[PDB]
Design a protein around this nucleic acid. Structure first.
Ligand SMILES: OC[C@H]1O[C@@](CO)(O[C@H]2O[C@H](CO)[C@@H](O)[C@H](O)[C@H]2O)[C@@H](O)[C@@H]1O
Ligand code: MG
Length: 580
DNA sequence: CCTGACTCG
DNA sequence: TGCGAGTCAGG
């Protein structure tokens, strides 16, 4: 059938009730400076559709949007909030966000539209956005009749679904997780995205020129060593050259043809001088295509800023992700790529970039949750955790720990956090499974509490059907009971890792909320720009650095109280590169 | 659109 | 098979 609603030509009093489901539709996937195609409001008085030009030009409606005492229930309120920010309109009073509610209830559902969330509660009186707008080249806003009913149906679904979603959240002990963590964070992410990060495009272009030169040199050096020209960026063409023309050993047979992955070539390097060059070529090639050309493509022509979008409802562990561009994967590990960060600068003159990061948050969280005496003491002494681990598993004094020993102990710690497995560790350290198993046994002997936790968390996952984080985020693991070893093992590793990675995510999210409250209380001009999993990047007047050096670490370190202290390091400088 | 390469915590 | 993510050239 059809859903009744008023297609209003002007805003009316009854459309401004103090409780309503609100839809401010932005169809463009990237909502920055994007158009709002329509508005829908559902409240105690009825269902309404408003043309944006009319609603957003009405002083009464705008005041309503900005009145924190007028409560709104929405789906992906950040999208609407940011689209409105670009129009100079403030959105306040969002008391419920269906996207975040659904995400917390079950991140694996992949809910990305009202229909998907409603289907969770057997409500299907609303169409999927894709069905209405289509996808790809066929994407398009339907005629008003169609658009209007869709927005109203979405608003009606939100209106109806709020109660049941909140009820289940409460049963899961996630009510505060939504109301006191994710929703307030949503508003903070909106400010960060809207603020954007300034890019020194002239610096990027010059780096681009220099890379084009080096890339040319390496490219020619590769054709020279191969005795012919070919597409180096073609794993297929590359494979023929390496394993056929040059007769290099085939140590890995992937899906189709051969494998020319990083660790495969790293092992082939000793056989021919071409391998090193191919690796370097790929390194520089990625910098050019993605961090030079790709980045320049998304920099706003006028402001020279990039405005990422933090997807707050995607990862299975509670982390955020970043896109167009992804500002959470800018090079830093290799010096040549790290230079890219010199192109990220403060948005105002005489300002600086300030970066604060948690030191070993994952292992500190593990110590807390597993309550391992040895691991908690290590952090209480603020020891170099990898050196300490080597001392324990290899039974040597601190002075006897060699560089190679620390390296392997470090790999063991990663394995432990990721969900330790003979095969996995062996593959990473390039050693036998038995040897890797020996390392693992030694680790558990030194950290019996961690062994206990890994055993218990897997059992708990099987009993309850899910695992939880410090702030009650959850992840269902049905595969934990699979009689297929490989499938079950994936689930077991997830049971071990999710509480760690997820809890670390919970912590920094609270740190961000606490920090913004502090910045506001102090009326500092400093503001957050980015979050990179265990670090927070801000920009501020140079005159605020001394205050930031004390405030940021303290806030981050005190976000939550664990059985071991939380440690935060920080640096600042003229560019992101210099904030080291 | 899919694969395999690279980037990050 | 070690955990969690995104982007791009070639197929
Ligand atoms: O507004 C972000 C919000 O929208 C979703 C859809 O529910 O993702 C859309 O927007 C992202 C940023 O432009 C795209 O990467 C994604 O492809 C598009 O569907 C959510 O995942 C997200 O929380
Ligand atoms: Mg760190």
């Amino acid at each position: 059938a059809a859903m009744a609603f008023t297609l209003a030509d002007r805003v009316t009093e009854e459309m401004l009730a103090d409780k309503a489901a609100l839809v401010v539709e932005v169809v463009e996937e990237n909502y920055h400076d994007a158009p709002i195609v329509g508005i829908a409001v559902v409240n105690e008085h009825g269902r309404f559709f408003l043309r944006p030009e009319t609603a957003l030009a009405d002083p009464q409606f705008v005041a309503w949007l900005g009145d924190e005492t007028k409560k709104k229930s929405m789906f992906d309120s950040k999208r609407a909030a940011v689209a409105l920010k670009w129009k100079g309109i403030e959105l306040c009073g969002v008391s419920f966000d269906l996207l975040l509610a659904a995400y917390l209830l079950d991140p694996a559902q992949g809910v990305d539209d009202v229909a998907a969330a409603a289907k969770m509660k057997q409500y299907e009186a609303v169409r999927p956005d894709e069905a209405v707008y289509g996808k790809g080249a066929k994407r398009a806003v339907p005629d008003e009749p169609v658009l209007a009913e869709h927005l109203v149906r979405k608003a009606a679904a939100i209106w109806e679904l709020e109660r049941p979603f909140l009820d289940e959240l409460r049963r899961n002990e996630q009510d505060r997780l939504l109301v006191e963590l994710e929703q307030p964070l949503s508003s903070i992410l909106a400010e960060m995205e809207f603020a954007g990060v300034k890019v020194d495009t002239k610096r990027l272009e010059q780096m681009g020129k220099e890379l084009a030169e080096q890339l040319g040199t390496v490219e020619q050096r590769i054709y020279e060593l191969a005795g012919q020209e070919f597409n180096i960026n073609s794993p297929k063409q590359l494979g023929v050259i390496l394993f056929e023309k040059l007769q290099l050993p085939v140590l890995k047979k992937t899906k189709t043809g051969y494998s020319t992955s990083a660790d495969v070539l790293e092992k082939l390097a000793p056989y021919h001088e071409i391998v090193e060059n191919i690796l370097h070529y790929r390194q520089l090639g990625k910098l050019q295509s993605t961090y030079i050309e790709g980045l320049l493509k998304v920099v706003r022509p006028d402001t020279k800023k990039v405005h990422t979008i933090f997807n707050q409802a995607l990862t299975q562990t509670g982390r955020l992700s970043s896109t167009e561009p992804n500002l959470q994967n800018i090079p830093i590990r290799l010096e040549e790529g790290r230079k890219i960060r010199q192109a990220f600068v403060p948005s105002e003159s005489d300002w600086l970039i300030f970066a604060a990061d948690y030191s070993q948050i994952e292992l500190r969280v593990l110590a807390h949750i597993a309550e391992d005496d040895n691991l908690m003491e290590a952090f209480r002494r603020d020891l170099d955790i990898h050196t300490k681990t080597a001392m324990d598993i290899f039974q040597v004094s601190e002075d006897e720990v060699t560089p190679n020993m620390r390296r392997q102990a470090k790999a063991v710690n990663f394995g432990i956090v990721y969900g330790i497995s003979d095969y996995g560790l062996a593959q990473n350290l390039n050693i036998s499974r038995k040897e890797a198993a020996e390392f693992i046994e030694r680790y558990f002997e030194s950290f019996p509490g961690v062994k206990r936790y890994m055993e218990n968390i897997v059992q708990e996952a099987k009993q309850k059907g899910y695992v939880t984080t410090l702030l009650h985020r959850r992840r269902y693991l049905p595969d934990i009971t699979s009689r297929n070893f490989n499938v079950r093992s994936f689930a077991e590793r997830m049971a071990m890792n999710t509480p760690i990675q997820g809890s670390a995510a919970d912590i920094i999210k609270k740190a961000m909320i606490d920090l913004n409250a502090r910045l506001k209380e102090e009326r500092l001009q400093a503001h957050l720009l980015l979050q990179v999993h265990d670090e927070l990047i801000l920009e501020a007047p140079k005159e605020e650095m001394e205050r930031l050096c004390r405030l940021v670490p303290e806030v981050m370190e005190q976000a939550v109280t664990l059985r071991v202290p939380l440690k935060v390091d920080y640096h600042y400088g003229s560019t992101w590169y210099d904030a080291k």
